Amino acid sequence: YRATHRLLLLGAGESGKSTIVKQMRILHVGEKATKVQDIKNNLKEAIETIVAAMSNLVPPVELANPENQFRVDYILSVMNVPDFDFPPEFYEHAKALWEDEGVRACYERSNEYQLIDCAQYFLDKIDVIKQADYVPSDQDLLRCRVLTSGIFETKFQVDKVNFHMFDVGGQRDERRKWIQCFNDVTAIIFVVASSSYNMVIREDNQTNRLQEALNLFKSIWNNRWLRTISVILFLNKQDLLAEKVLAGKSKIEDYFPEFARYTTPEDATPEPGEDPRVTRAKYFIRDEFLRISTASGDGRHYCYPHFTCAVDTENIRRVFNDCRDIIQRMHLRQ
Amino acid sequence: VGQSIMHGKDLEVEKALKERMIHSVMPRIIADDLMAFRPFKMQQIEEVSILFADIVGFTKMSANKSAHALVGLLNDLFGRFDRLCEETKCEKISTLGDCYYCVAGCPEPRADHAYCCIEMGLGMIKAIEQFCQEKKEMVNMRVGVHTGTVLCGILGMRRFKFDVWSNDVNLANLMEQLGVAGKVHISEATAKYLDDRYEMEDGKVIERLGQSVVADQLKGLKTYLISGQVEADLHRTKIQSMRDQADWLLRNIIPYHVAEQLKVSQTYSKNHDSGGVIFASIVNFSEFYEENYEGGKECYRVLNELIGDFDELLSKPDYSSIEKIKTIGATYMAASGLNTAQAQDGSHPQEHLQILFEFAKEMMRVVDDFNNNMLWFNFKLRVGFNHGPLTAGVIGTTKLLYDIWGDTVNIASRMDTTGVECRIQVSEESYRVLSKMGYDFDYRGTVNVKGKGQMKTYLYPKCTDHRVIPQHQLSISPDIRVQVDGSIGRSPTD
Numbered sequence A: 001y002r003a004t005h006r007l008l009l010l011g012a013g014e015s016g017k018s019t020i021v022k023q024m025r026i027l028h029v030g031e032k033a034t035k036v037q038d039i040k041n042n043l044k045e046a047i048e049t050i051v052a053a054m055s056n057l058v059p060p061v062e063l064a065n066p067e068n069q070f071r072v073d074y075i076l077s078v079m080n081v082p083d084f085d086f087p088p089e090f091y092e093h094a095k096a097l098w099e100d101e102g103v104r105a106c107y108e109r110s111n112e113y114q115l116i117d118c119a120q121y122f123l124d125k126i127d128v129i130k131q132a133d134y135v136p137s138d139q140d141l142l143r144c145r146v147l148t149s150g151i152f153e154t155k156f157q158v159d160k161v162n163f164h165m166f167d168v169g170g171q172r173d174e175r176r177k178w179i180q181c182f183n184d185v186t187a188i189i190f191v192v193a194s195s196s197y198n199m200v201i202r203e204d205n206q207t208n209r210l211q212e213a214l215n216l217f218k219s220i221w222n223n224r225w226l227r228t229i230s231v232i233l234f235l236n237k238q239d240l241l242a243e244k245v246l247a248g249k250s251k252i253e254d255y256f257p258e259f260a261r262y263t264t265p266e267d268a269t270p271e272p273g274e275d276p277r278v279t280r281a282k283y284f285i286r287d288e289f290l291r292i293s294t295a296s297g298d299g300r301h302y303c304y305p306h307f308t309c310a311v312d313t314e315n316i317r318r319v320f321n322d323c324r325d326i327i328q329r330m331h332l333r334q
Numbered sequence B: 001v002g003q004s005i006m007h008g009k010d011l012e013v014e015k016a017l018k019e020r021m022i023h024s025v026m027p028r029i030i031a032d033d034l035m036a037f038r039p040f041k042m043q044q045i046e047e048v049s050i051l052f053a054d055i056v057g058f059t060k061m062s063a064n065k066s067a068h069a070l071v072g073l074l075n076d077l078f079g080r081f082d083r084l085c086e087e088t089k090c091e092k093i094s095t096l097g098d099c100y101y102c103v104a105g106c107p108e109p110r111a112d113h114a115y116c117c118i119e120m121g122l123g124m125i126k127a128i129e130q131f132c133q134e135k136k137e138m139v140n141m142r143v144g145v146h147t148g149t150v151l152c153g154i155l156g157m158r159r160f161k162f163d164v165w166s167n168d169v170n171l172a173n174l175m176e177q178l179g180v181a182g183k184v185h186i187s188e189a190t191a192k193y194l195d196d197r198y199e200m201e202d203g204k205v206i207e208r209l210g211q212s213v214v215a216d217q218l219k220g221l222k223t224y225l226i227s228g229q230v231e232a233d234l235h236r237t238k239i240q241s242m243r244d245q246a247d248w249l250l251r252n253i254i255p256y257h258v259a260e261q262l263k264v265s266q267t268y269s270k271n272h273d274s275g276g277v278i279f280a281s282i283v284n285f286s287e288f289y290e291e292n293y294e295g296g297k298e299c300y301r302v303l304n305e306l307i308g309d310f311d312e313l314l315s316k317p318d319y320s321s322i323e324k325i326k327t328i329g330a331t332y333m334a335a336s337g338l339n340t341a342q343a344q345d346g347s348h349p350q351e352h353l354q355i356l357f358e359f360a361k362e363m364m365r366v367v368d369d370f371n372n373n374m375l376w377f378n379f380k381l382r383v384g385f386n387h388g389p390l391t392a393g394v395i396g397t398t399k400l401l402y403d404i405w406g407d408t409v410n411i412a413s414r415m416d417t418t419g420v421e422c423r424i425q426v427s428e429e430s431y432r433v434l435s436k437m438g439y440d441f442d443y444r445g446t447v448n449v450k451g452k453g454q455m456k457t458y459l460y461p462k463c464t465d466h467r468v469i470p471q472h473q474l475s476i477s478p479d480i481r482v483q484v485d486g487s488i489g490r491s492p493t494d
């Protein structure tokens, strides 16, 4: 117990904590039918959310092909039906809708509603998933989204060093449970969906997701029982941040006006071939939490920012390798 | 040389004193073990039978009796109960007002813990009959037993005592509340470890008590009723440390003036013509408490931080005249005016009430500060305030215990339970004394208080926004508490 490192994963909803747990299980560590079931549930949720939001957007998005209009209604018909059997008709209709240009245009405006992160990945894999002999790959398992309620513990070992990952729920109603893991915690890994700067949280549909994460990190950093606990900042969803930055449809400054005057720090270490815009956006997001950490960093604890992509196994492996020495150093400091 | 021998003898005496003081607040096992987050003593123990018992008819028995007589009768009854606990292999937790509760299988596991609890309850009924015979009283026992998992340990820093917290403890308290005087009210769980050795009948909770505000017929939970079957300096330093430990552990049980009065007599009893009582319950702790992770132990650690914060209020010089009596689950019990043995010059006769009211306000502030450190969850504190004559007494000879009794404590608990969250509900007379001292109150309405009918209650924080219209709460139906709170032993029965 004294030789094991207790790493508590914190952060707002859909930040990527469960995907970090999955990456730890992949690296250092009947059920397959359940995993396929949640994968298909994610597929159905994505398609129904997009179809419903087509008429709910301002302005509403019309279907590119009118002949697919009935295909929408079926998706609307079985939206609230639980324990769906997923017939081949549903798969065909979902594929036809996803190939429609109007549905894609509605998907490009997914920041105007609440859509899961694994939408495109599974809507482009419908054909493979729809098979009765569908075997979910490691990336398919990583992309699967399941809301986490409660405290989950995963014990793994790296280089004969024991780690105990405490995964919690990121929604507000779950945050009251977080204090149950604040005792004897070696490290806090705060996962942030860095690409969610243009999205609002599900709890109230008004608070910005990145602003919600910033407020949550301010609460965690200035917590009474976490005054001497260093927080390893996981700036997650870097790939989606890069796509959103290169797309240019949702500018960072349109939601965080201080980004316009921001300039890339000289200590930046971008990956080779990285676009300067992505580097600037990601380092602005990093400095947003660095400001909070330094506002009360009296030397009792420190913030370690890492640009992570949870669905990327190699990137998470490198990040955890870079974090292992930090974690053991803070355990010594404890 | 002779100083060393005297130091050794007095060190043996003080070691015995410290051992006795520890034994009064902890089980013998934990007492022997003794010899960011604050230190937290709690363990999850399964298969524990929790028993609660209420003295039915306590209000009439204690009527028209001096403090000495009432404390003597209570000491006799609780001594019989303690002998019974020793005989039945049960572990007494504490006594509150007219209530006595114990656990079997905690902290040492017992295969027949349910049998131990049932036997102890039946013996308690028998001993209460004997007490009525010898003391010419008319009182009974209402006993309730439930078997389940408990979280046993210590909460807070001041006046801490070994206790049990869980949903099963609350269910056992519910069993006691819904029971019948002279019978043991066992839960459905307890009957699973019991054979046909007892005369058992249906609990008939829905028939007897009528309405069930807890749930629809206890949420489909059955129940049963059982009616029966260099050297000098080193020695000086060591003895000084031992004496400091012994007196600090004695302060953990009884107030300082009680300690003075107990140096002459083996028993203590005082009748305070004017004393104030506050019960401050954390209403939504059940919302926070969840048994999914580590049986909720960590949750109670958070509670251990809140109660300890209240325990830091007593260390302030302003609240030196305030004595914490006990903590009951998520309820904090405090009193004032007991220490006022001498009328100090220049002090208001009711200054202790002002100090206790300020203590309740500071508890509200402490709760706000604690919520500032919680993540999207706010603990709500509900305080009940009353003042009047009461009887303070020490219960027990070997294992000491300080307690208070009277209609004042009952009315204070009533204002705690009938009050509103984040506000202090004070009694009518308490309003008459506080408002004369520059305090502003909102007339909440009338509350059904036993012995006074509809009595006016006043909520302290006068809400400038909106108005508190007279609620006029006339609910005289049995207030069934689904959790352990300050009403334990402060609600007299038939």
Ligand SMILES: Nc1nc2c(ncn2[C@@H]2O[C@H](COP(=O)(O)OP(=O)(O)OP(O)(O)=S)[C@@H](O)[C@H]2O)c(=O)[nH]1
Pocket (backbone or CB within 6 Å): A011, A012, A013, A014, A015, A016, A017, A018, A019, A020, A117, A118, A142, A143, A144, A145, A146, A147, A148, A149, A168, A169, A170, A171, A236, A237, A238, A239, A240, A308, A309, A310, A311, A312
């Ligand atoms: N492209 C990409 N997707 C990611 C990344 N990290 C997480 N996701 C996806 O985002 C979704 C939400 O992540 P998730 O693991 O559920 O966050 P969470 O904090 O655990 O969610 P919650 O239960 O507390 S509300 C998942 O479907 C996951 O596949 C990432 O780095 N890149």
Ligand SMILES: [Mg+2]
Pocket (backbone or CB within 6 Å): A017, A018, A147, A148, A167, A168, A169, A170
């Ligand atoms: Mg999660």
